[PDB]
Enzyme design. Structure first.
Site, PDB file in Angstrom:
ATOM      1  N   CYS A 109       0.834  -1.215   0.142  1.00  0.00           N
ATOM      2  CA  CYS A 109      -0.058  -0.114  -0.045  1.00  0.00           C
ATOM      3  C   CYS A 109       0.794   1.406   0.051  1.00  0.00           C
ATOM      4  CB  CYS A 109      -0.820  -0.069   1.164  1.00  0.00           C
ATOM      5  SG  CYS A 109      -1.970   1.573   1.236  1.00  0.00           S
ATOM      6  N   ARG A 112       0.455   4.789   2.844  1.00  0.00           N
ATOM      7  CA  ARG A 112       0.345   4.520   4.307  1.00  0.00           C
ATOM      8  C   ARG A 112       0.967   5.851   5.028  1.00  0.00           C
ATOM      9  NH1 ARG A 112       4.058  -0.415   4.706  1.00  0.00           N
ATOM     10  NH2 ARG A 112       4.673  -0.152   2.130  1.00  0.00           N
ATOM     11  N   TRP A 281      -8.698   6.128  -0.927  1.00  0.00           N
ATOM     12  CA  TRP A 281      -8.948   6.636  -1.955  1.00  0.00           C
ATOM     13  C   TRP A 281      -8.161   6.085  -2.825  1.00  0.00           C
ATOM     14  CZ3 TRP A 281      -8.280   9.961   2.528  1.00  0.00           C
ATOM     15  CH2 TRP A 281      -6.811  10.119   2.385  1.00  0.00           C
ATOM     16  N   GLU A 286      -4.246   3.360 -10.635  1.00  0.00           N
ATOM     17  CA  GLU A 286      -4.981   2.168 -10.315  1.00  0.00           C
ATOM     18  C   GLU A 286      -6.341   2.287 -11.370  1.00  0.00           C
ATOM     19  OE1 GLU A 286      -5.896   1.234  -5.804  1.00  0.00           O
ATOM     20  OE2 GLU A 286      -5.490   3.274  -5.820  1.00  0.00           O
TER      21      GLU A 286
HETATM   22  C1  HEM Z   1      -5.881   6.514   2.170  1.00  0.00           C
HETATM   23  C2  HEM Z   1      -5.524   6.373   0.933  1.00  0.00           C
HETATM   24  C3  HEM Z   1      -5.055   5.076   0.430  1.00  0.00           C
HETATM   25  C4  HEM Z   1      -4.282   5.064  -0.746  1.00  0.00           C
HETATM   26  C5  HEM Z   1      -3.957   6.196  -1.832  1.00  0.00           C
HETATM   27  C6  HEM Z   1      -3.711   3.603  -0.908  1.00  0.00           C
HETATM   28  C7  HEM Z   1      -3.243   3.143  -1.932  1.00  0.00           C
HETATM   29  C8  HEM Z   1      -2.832   1.986  -2.392  1.00  0.00           C
HETATM   30  C9  HEM Z   1      -2.668   1.461  -3.746  1.00  0.00           C
HETATM   31  C10 HEM Z   1      -2.433   2.286  -5.106  1.00  0.00           C
HETATM   32  C11 HEM Z   1      -2.616   0.051  -3.736  1.00  0.00           C
HETATM   33  C12 HEM Z   1      -2.137  -0.746  -4.824  1.00  0.00           C
HETATM   34  C13 HEM Z   1      -3.533  -1.696  -4.919  1.00  0.00           C
HETATM   35  C14 HEM Z   1      -3.347  -2.508  -6.321  1.00  0.00           C
HETATM   36  O1  HEM Z   1      -2.461  -1.963  -7.191  1.00  0.00           O
HETATM   37  O2  HEM Z   1      -3.833  -3.271  -6.331  1.00  0.00           O
HETATM   38  C15 HEM Z   1      -2.796  -0.299  -2.186  1.00  0.00           C
HETATM   39  C16 HEM Z   1      -2.792  -1.609  -1.730  1.00  0.00           C
HETATM   40  C17 HEM Z   1      -3.129  -1.866  -0.475  1.00  0.00           C
HETATM   41  N1  HEM Z   1      -3.645  -1.079   0.265  1.00  0.00           N
HETATM   42 FE1  HEM Z   1      -3.951   0.719   0.203  1.00  0.00          FE
HETATM   43  N2  HEM Z   1      -4.332   2.932  -0.103  1.00  0.00           N
HETATM   44  C18 HEM Z   1      -4.958   3.765   0.711  1.00  0.00           C
HETATM   45  C19 HEM Z   1      -5.871   3.355   1.971  1.00  0.00           C
HETATM   46  C20 HEM Z   1      -5.665   2.158   2.644  1.00  0.00           C
HETATM   47  C21 HEM Z   1      -6.280   1.644   3.930  1.00  0.00           C
HETATM   48  C22 HEM Z   1      -7.405   2.525   4.537  1.00  0.00           C
HETATM   49  C23 HEM Z   1      -6.075   0.372   4.030  1.00  0.00           C
HETATM   50  C24 HEM Z   1      -6.289  -0.509   5.091  1.00  0.00           C
HETATM   51  C25 HEM Z   1      -6.647   0.053   6.222  1.00  0.00           C
HETATM   52  C26 HEM Z   1      -4.946   0.225   2.904  1.00  0.00           C
HETATM   53  C27 HEM Z   1      -4.427  -1.296   2.773  1.00  0.00           C
HETATM   54  C28 HEM Z   1      -3.881  -1.967   1.850  1.00  0.00           C
HETATM   55  C29 HEM Z   1      -3.541  -3.256   1.614  1.00  0.00           C
HETATM   56  C30 HEM Z   1      -3.800  -4.205   2.511  1.00  0.00           C
HETATM   57  C31 HEM Z   1      -3.174  -3.210   0.042  1.00  0.00           C
HETATM   58  C32 HEM Z   1      -2.788  -4.419  -0.744  1.00  0.00           C
HETATM   59  C33 HEM Z   1      -3.836  -5.025  -1.424  1.00  0.00           C
HETATM   60  C34 HEM Z   1      -3.675  -6.065  -2.560  1.00  0.00           C
HETATM   61  O3  HEM Z   1      -2.647  -6.613  -2.431  1.00  0.00           O
HETATM   62  O4  HEM Z   1      -4.724  -6.328  -3.362  1.00  0.00           O
HETATM   63  N3  HEM Z   1      -4.905   1.036   1.971  1.00  0.00           N
HETATM   64  N4  HEM Z   1      -3.149   0.983  -1.458  1.00  0.00           N
HETATM   65  F1  6J0 Z   2      -6.156 -12.284  -3.694  1.00  0.00           F
HETATM   66  C1  6J0 Z   2      -5.837 -11.807  -4.894  1.00  0.00           C
HETATM   67  C2  6J0 Z   2      -5.469 -12.373  -6.034  1.00  0.00           C
HETATM   68  C3  6J0 Z   2      -5.113 -11.966  -7.041  1.00  0.00           C
HETATM   69  C4  6J0 Z   2      -4.846 -10.739  -7.270  1.00  0.00           C
HETATM   70  C5  6J0 Z   2      -5.158  -9.869  -6.067  1.00  0.00           C
HETATM   71  C6  6J0 Z   2      -4.836  -8.535  -6.207  1.00  0.00           C
HETATM   72  C7  6J0 Z   2      -5.741  -7.716  -5.680  1.00  0.00           C
HETATM   73  N1  6J0 Z   2      -6.077  -6.224  -5.897  1.00  0.00           N
HETATM   74  C8  6J0 Z   2      -7.230  -5.511  -6.277  1.00  0.00           C
HETATM   75  C9  6J0 Z   2      -7.103  -4.322  -6.586  1.00  0.00           C
HETATM   76  N2  6J0 Z   2      -6.402  -3.614  -5.197  1.00  0.00           N
HETATM   77  C10 6J0 Z   2      -7.386  -2.727  -4.498  1.00  0.00           C
HETATM   78  C11 6J0 Z   2      -8.729  -2.333  -4.999  1.00  0.00           C
HETATM   79  C12 6J0 Z   2      -9.547  -1.589  -4.489  1.00  0.00           C
HETATM   80  N3  6J0 Z   2      -9.176  -0.743  -3.442  1.00  0.00           N
HETATM   81  C13 6J0 Z   2      -7.644  -0.986  -2.901  1.00  0.00           C
HETATM   82  N4  6J0 Z   2      -7.230  -0.204  -1.918  1.00  0.00           N
HETATM   83  C14 6J0 Z   2      -8.412   0.430  -1.041  1.00  0.00           C
HETATM   84  C15 6J0 Z   2      -7.338   0.979  -0.259  1.00  0.00           C
HETATM   85  N5  6J0 Z   2      -6.082   0.715  -0.615  1.00  0.00           N
HETATM   86  C16 6J0 Z   2      -6.082  -0.249  -1.655  1.00  0.00           C
HETATM   87  N6  6J0 Z   2      -6.917  -2.017  -3.437  1.00  0.00           N
HETATM   88  C17 6J0 Z   2      -5.596 -10.545  -4.860  1.00  0.00           C
END
Ligand code: HEM
Ligand code: 6J0
Ligand code: HEM
Ligand code: 6J0
Ligand code: H4B
Ligand code: H4B
Ligand code: MTL
Ligand code: MTL
Ligand code: ZN
Lengths: 405, 404
Positions: A109, A112, A281, A286
């Site tokens: 993420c 953070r 957000w 993305e």
């Molecule tokens: C506040 C604004 C936030 C921004 C700009 C942001 C940005 C991002 C971005 C760009 C990714 C890559 C997602 C992808 O390419 O699939 C990501 C992944 C992730 N974020 Fe955030 N995030 C935000 C908030 C949060 C919050 C509130 C949480 C949890 C409390 C969080 C937890 C995670 C986690 C666990 C991933 C990995 C998701 C995955 O692997 O599919 N993020 N974030």
């Molecule tokens: F369990 C999996 C199996 C294959 C691909 C995968 C990637 C998942 N990523 C989906 C896009 N990530 C997203 C989507 C919407 N929102 C956020 N998000 C929200 C706050 N921070 C990130 N992240 C997981």
């Protein structure tokens, strides 16, 4: 030098050592013999208790009462709870701390810098699919906040031994349907063909647009998932237009405001919250790059390049690059116009660099997955590209979990 | 266990079995991944086993494995290591080893070409002067009036009793970086230190933004010697844009030949501390990294302003827009100058083909995803969606510390 990973920023020449990785209690997929850092996916009371003790220690550290009577009392209260029930429960403030720490700890993420500002909704009293729906609707309303997005997470009851999981079947609270066609092509989002077909098999009357919001498939313990259609007024969407290419609006593209991951497991102190949707957000890439330009997603690159009159018949014209840039600009411009929070990949990565510096001072490091932190366009144009990163798993953590079906 | 490797665009899965062939440890452990790190943090029997392993690879490659000449060659190596503590490669083995080092190079996106490599045996080099002659021939051969040809020149191996043959430059052709009084740099900031070393070793400095550095060539245990590349040998491309007529007036240029001169080539336990190699450029190396990196020529803002973009805010994506035009300029200009270049789309597509070939040929392919995925438009290329396994196979190119 010190015996910790040495981390270099190549743009700045600065060096840090990650000592935080020493806290990792969980192995990643890499070994000395091979790096698997580019793989998307990886592959008991005594265990629980150590994880619990460790988390309770983190919590009491965070409130600066490590070693204190209350710390020892809380530790004992947890052992005795696990002793008689095989599990235990988090105090509200522990849950809040744990949720924030799981975000803070999320290597993938880039958002953070915001980690301390997370609204944690305790939904651990939820006892049905209907109530899950209400909590989710509430979450969406709070988090969307009419375009002024607010980070939030709603935590549903934890996995209970002997009892089935709360599961949100959708991977996101808001995602678009993907309808498989006769020709074999997909109308809508190809990422979502399976879940779309599950929605239909569970009674959803499907639309036939490219941007139909999926209904929620919500599963309370030991029940079939129930289907809940989000009221359109709750789902904020942004029609996409371009600041200078007037025809771009005629593509009829749109995206939703709220990126909410709904199918990750939030693990805190050995406790597993199988339903803990969180939302932040969007970072513009993305949507602009991945959701709209991925070949296996909406794949609109050629459409846009043709409208831009680019030579799509040769790679060297950089038509993919030109079109992608304009789509990304359109996403940003349209979210800004519609007053919906969005962050471009330059602002996001600059803020992540600040986050890295904060965390270096706060914790002696920051687990970060370079491949995911570096944006999918303009990689080296952002400062994070030049920043070596150490990836490791800290707990509390968000983990992927298999699809419930 | 063999890593399962998925391509997320196509949904296809492979298993890398080749990684089991790795005898050398990378920086990762199960506790933490260090895959994004550019550099590593840091006797007869071991040499003999690397030698045997390599000779076995060699004879297997010419499909004469277990045969006669194979066993004789293994005997020769063993007898030589036993009596001398080292051995020497036959030219044919050296040629095979160099191609294999290239094939095994996880960071190289150009590996589809690995079988077409001209290998110059410079192991009969006894002085910096002779190195310079070999290097000049390398450049001439490799440049080939713009029809670039992959080449490597292999200088004498390291020997336990003495200093290394070393080229002090990191590339055969690179531009000087002159630290100005006001802390700024004229030319390439990446080359300030080597530029200063050249001056201190008696080079008369230019003051241009694109002054080709002289070579600092070191024969064993001697001070490095300075040699100026004959300008006619160094093919350069003035950069112009196909539509932005003002772009040519920026005065930007880049050299044709990307030639790494400071990596160590390890083959069969033998280390070649000077074995400069060259291929051709992928455009993003020039357009994006060399010209647009903040700590390099850093021309993004200048181009963006010439493009009249809103430079005051990130959200206008002026950097992305400028970068694209610069890369476009690089491609157009090399194509106009009839100088071999590959755009990052063509290169990554060919690399995917290479991954497929190697999966069939060897059961895998060591690949460093962070390096293979281009610096702009990452996910617009197929390699972004391709999981990769990174590991060190031998023969290998390795980094080595700067000789000073
Ligand atoms: C506040 C604004 C936030 C921004 C700009 C942001 C940005 C991002 C971005 C760009 C990714 C890559 C997602 C992808 O390419 O699939 C990501 C992944 C992730 N974020 Fe955030 N995030 C935000 C908030 C949060 C919050 C509130 C949480 C949890 C409390 C969080 C937890 C995670 C986690 C666990 C991933 C990995 C998701 C995955 O692997 O599919 N993020 N974030
Ligand atoms: F369990 C999996 C199996 C294959 C691909 C995968 C990637 C998942 N990523 C989906 C896009 N990530 C997203 C989507 C919407 N929102 C956020 N998000 C929200 C706050 N921070 C990130 N992240 C997981
Ligand atoms: C023939 C056309 C070639 C192309 C298009 C090509 C492409 C590339 C690219 C884009 C990189 C990343 C460079 C960087 O950003 O530093 C690279 C690195 C590398 N290449 Fe190639 N290459 C070619 C030929 C060769 C040859 C002939 C060899 C050796 C015989 C070779 C061996 C390597 C090695 C060892 C690296 C890692 C270098 C480093 O870490 O600085 N390549 N190549
Ligand atoms: F020892 C090191 C310390 C810091 C950075 C580093 C990598 C630098 N890479 C230089 C650019 N790579 C280049 C340059 C010229 N030519 C090629 N090239 C030619 C054929 N294949 C690649 N690659 C090493
Ligand atoms: C193969 C590779 O790991 C995969 O495509 C990754 C690369 N980096 C990513 N980075 C982000 N932020 N999101 C992603 O989905 C991916 N996909
Ligand atoms: C820190 C990071 O590993 C470093 O910037 C890498 C990233 N990817 C790269 N990829 C290539 N091809 N060349 C590079 O120099 C780099 N630099
Ligand atoms: O349509 C089904 C897919 O969207 C689903 O399997 C997601 O990829 C998964 O839930 C992501 O974790
Ligand atoms: O000016 C010296 C630098 O160019 C040099 O140290 C390179 O960064 C290094 O040799 C690359 O291997
Ligand atoms: Zn790793």
């Amino acid at each position: 030098g010190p015996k910790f990973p040495r981390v270099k920023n190549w743009e700045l020449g600065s060096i840090t050592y990650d000592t935080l990785c020493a806290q990792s209690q969980q192995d990643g997929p890499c070994t000395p013999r091979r790096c698997l850092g580019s793989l998307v996916l990886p592959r008991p009371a005594e265990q629980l208790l150590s994880q619990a003790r460790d988390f309770i220690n983190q919590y009491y550290s965070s409130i600066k009462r490590s070693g204190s009577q209350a710390h020892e009392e809380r530790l004992q209260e947890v052992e005795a709870e696990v002793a008689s029930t095989g599990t235990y429960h988090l105090r509200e403030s522990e849950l809040v701390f744990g949720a924030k720490q799981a975000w803070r700890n999320a290597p993938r993420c880039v958002g953070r810098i915001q980690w301390g500002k997370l609204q944690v909704f305790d939904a651990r009293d939820c006892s049905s699919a209907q109530e899950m729906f209400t909590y989710i609707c509430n979450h969406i309303k709070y988090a969307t906040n009419r375009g002024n997005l607010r980070s939030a997470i709603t935590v549903f009851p934890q996995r209970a031994p002997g009892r089935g999981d709360f599961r949100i079947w959708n991977s996101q609270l808001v995602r678009y349907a993907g309808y498989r066609q006769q020709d074999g092509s997909v109308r809508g989002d190809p990422a979502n063909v399976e879940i779309t077909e599950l929605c239909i098999q569970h009674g959803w009357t499907p639309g036939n647009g490219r941007f139909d919001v999926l209904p929620l498939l919500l599963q309370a313990p030991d029940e079939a998932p129930e289907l809940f259609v989000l009221p359109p007024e709750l789902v904020l969407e942004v029609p996409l237009e371009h600041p200078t290419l007037e025809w771009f609006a005629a593509l009829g593209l749109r995206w939703y405001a709220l990126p909410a991951v709904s199918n990750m497991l939030l693990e805190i102190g050995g406790l597993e919250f199988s339903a803990a949707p969180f939302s932040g957000w969007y970072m513009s890439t993305e949507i602009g790059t991945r959701n709209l330009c991925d070949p296996h997603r909406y794949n609109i690159l050629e459409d846009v390049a043709v409208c831009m009159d680019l030579d799509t018949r040769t790679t060297s014209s950089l038509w993919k690059d030109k079109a992608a840039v304009e789509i990304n600009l359109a996403v940003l411009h349209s979210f800004q116009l519609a007053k919906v929070t969005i962050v471009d990949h330059h602002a996001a990565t600059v803020s992540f660099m600040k986050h890295l510096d904060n965390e270096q001072k706060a914790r002696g490091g920051c687990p970060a997955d370079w491949a995911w932190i570096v944006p999918p366009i303009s990689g080296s144009l952002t400062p994070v590209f030049h920043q070596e990163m150490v990836n490791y798993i800290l707990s509390p953590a968000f983990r992927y979990q298999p699809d419930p079906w």
